[PDB]
Design an enzyme around this catalytic site. Structure first.
Site, PDB file in Angstrom:
ATOM      1  N   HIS A  40      -5.736  -8.549  48.949  1.00 13.90           N
ATOM      2  CA  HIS A  40      -5.190  -9.815  49.222  1.00 13.90           C
ATOM      3  C   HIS A  40      -3.459  -8.962  48.932  1.00 13.90           C
ATOM      4  O   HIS A  40      -2.709  -8.931  49.060  1.00 13.90           O
ATOM      5  CB  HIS A  40      -5.610 -10.544  48.956  1.00 13.90           C
ATOM      6  N   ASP A  81     -12.969  -6.648  45.237  1.00  9.41           N
ATOM      7  CA  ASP A  81     -11.008  -7.562  46.093  1.00  9.41           C
ATOM      8  C   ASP A  81     -10.277  -6.381  44.750  1.00  9.41           C
ATOM      9  O   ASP A  81      -9.493  -6.390  43.981  1.00  9.41           O
ATOM     10  CB  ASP A  81     -10.527  -9.128  44.563  1.00  9.41           C
ATOM     11  N   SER A 167      -2.143 -11.322  40.293  1.00  9.09           N
ATOM     12  CA  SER A 167      -3.387 -10.642  40.623  1.00  9.09           C
ATOM     13  C   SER A 167      -2.800  -8.540  40.901  1.00  9.09           C
ATOM     14  O   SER A 167      -1.885  -7.877  41.143  1.00  9.09           O
ATOM     15  CB  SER A 167      -2.995 -10.561  42.031  1.00  9.09           C
ATOM     16  N   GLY A 168      -3.905  -8.322  40.982  1.00  5.81           N
ATOM     17  CA  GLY A 168      -3.763  -6.747  41.201  1.00  5.81           C
ATOM     18  C   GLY A 168      -2.993  -6.042  39.717  1.00  5.81           C
ATOM     19  O   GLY A 168      -3.646  -4.775  39.851  1.00  5.81           O
TER      20      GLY A 168
END
Ligand SMILES: NC(=O)c1nn(CC(=O)N2CCC[C@H]2C(=O)NCc2cccc(Cl)c2F)c2ccccc12
Length: 212
Positions: A40, A81, A167-168
Site C-alpha cells: 500500500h 503486502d 510500513s515497508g
C-alpha cells in the site's frame, strides 16, 4: 517507531525512504536497482539517509522506473503486502548505501529473538514525525500467539512498536531481513495487538522472479 531511539547515522545502509518530496514508507535496498517495500506504499526513493531534511554526504534521491506490487495484494488486506520498486538507475553503492541480504530459508525465527525495526514513522500517538531515522529492538512472537498464516510474523508491541510511516521498512534478525513492516492501519503500542510483518522467506520465489 514508538518507544524507540535514534539510529546511528547510516549504520543501516540498506534503509530507504519511499517518498511528493515527503516520506511515505520505509523500504529495504535488496539489490543495486531494487528496493523492497509494502504493497500500500504506492514515487521517489531516498538512499543513504539519516536526516530527511538535512544535507548529508551519502544522501541521494532516485526516481522509480517501475513499481511491482505483489499481484495478489488487495487494497483492503495486509496479505501479500509487498512491493518491489526498480530505481531509474543502479544505486551508487558504498558505506551508507548497501543492499541487505534477505531470508531465503523458509524457517521461523526462534520465538523470543530480539530483532531490529527501523523507520521514520511516527514517534508518538500525536502525529509526531521524526527528522532522523529511529529504531527499536522487539522480541518475535511464536506463530500460535501471533495467530490468536504461514506468511506473517508478529513482534511484541508493549509500547515499543512499528506504527504509521514505518510500513515497508525492515525487521532484521542477526543481520538478515526476516520481515517487512505491514502497510495497513492498526493500533500501535498495545501489548495485546502485536506488530505485524510480512515474512520475507514466504515470498522467496516471488522476489527472485521479479529480480530474475
Ligand atoms: N504497520 C503499522 O503499524 C501501520 N502501517 N500503517 C500504514 C501507513 O503508515 N501507510 C500506508 C502506506 C503509506 C503509509 C503512510 O500513511 N505514510 C504517510 C505518513 C503519515 C503520517 C506520518 C508519517 Cl511518518 C507518514 F509516513 C499505519 C497507519 C496507521 C497506524 C499504524 C500503521
Amino acid at each position: 517507531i514508538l518507544g524507540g531511539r535514534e539510529a546511528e547515522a547510516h549504520a543501516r545502509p540498506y534503509m530507504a525512504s519511499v517518498q511528493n518530496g515527503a516520506h511515505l514508507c520505509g523500504g529495504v535496498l535488496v539489490a543495486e536497482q531494487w528496493v523492497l517495500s509494502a504493497a500500500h506504499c504506492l514515487v521517489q526513493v531516498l538512499l543513504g539517509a539519516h536526516s530527511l531534511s538535512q544535507p548529508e554526504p551519502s544522501k541521494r534521491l532516485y526516481d522509480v522506473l517501475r513499481a511491482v506490487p505483489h499481484p495478489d495484494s488487495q487494497p483492503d488486506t495486509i496479505d501479500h503486502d509487498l512491493l518491489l520498486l526498480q530505481l531509474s538507475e543502479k544505486a551508487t553503492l558504498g558505506p551508507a548505501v548497501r543492499p541487505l541480504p534477505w531470508q531465503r530459508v523458509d524457517r521461523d525465527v526462534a520465538p523470543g529473538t530480539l530483532c531490529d525495526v527501523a523507520g521514520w514513522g511516527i514517534v508518538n500517538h500525536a502525529g509526531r514525525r521524526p527528522d532522523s531515522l529511529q529504531h527499536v529492538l522487539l522480541p518475535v512472537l511464536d506463530r500460535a500467539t501471533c495467530n490468536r498464516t504461514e506468511r506473517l510474523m508478529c513482534a511484541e508491541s508493549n509500547r515499543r512498536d512499528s506504527c504509521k510511516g514505518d510500513s515497508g521498512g525492515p525487521l532484521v534478525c542477526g543481520g538478515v531481513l526476516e520481515g517487512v513492516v505491514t502497510s495497513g492501519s492498526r493500533v500501535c503500542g498495545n501489548r495485546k495487538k502485536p506488530g505485524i510483518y510480512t515474512r520475507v522467506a514466504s515470498y522467496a520465489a516471488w522476489i527472485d522472479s521479479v529480480l530474475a
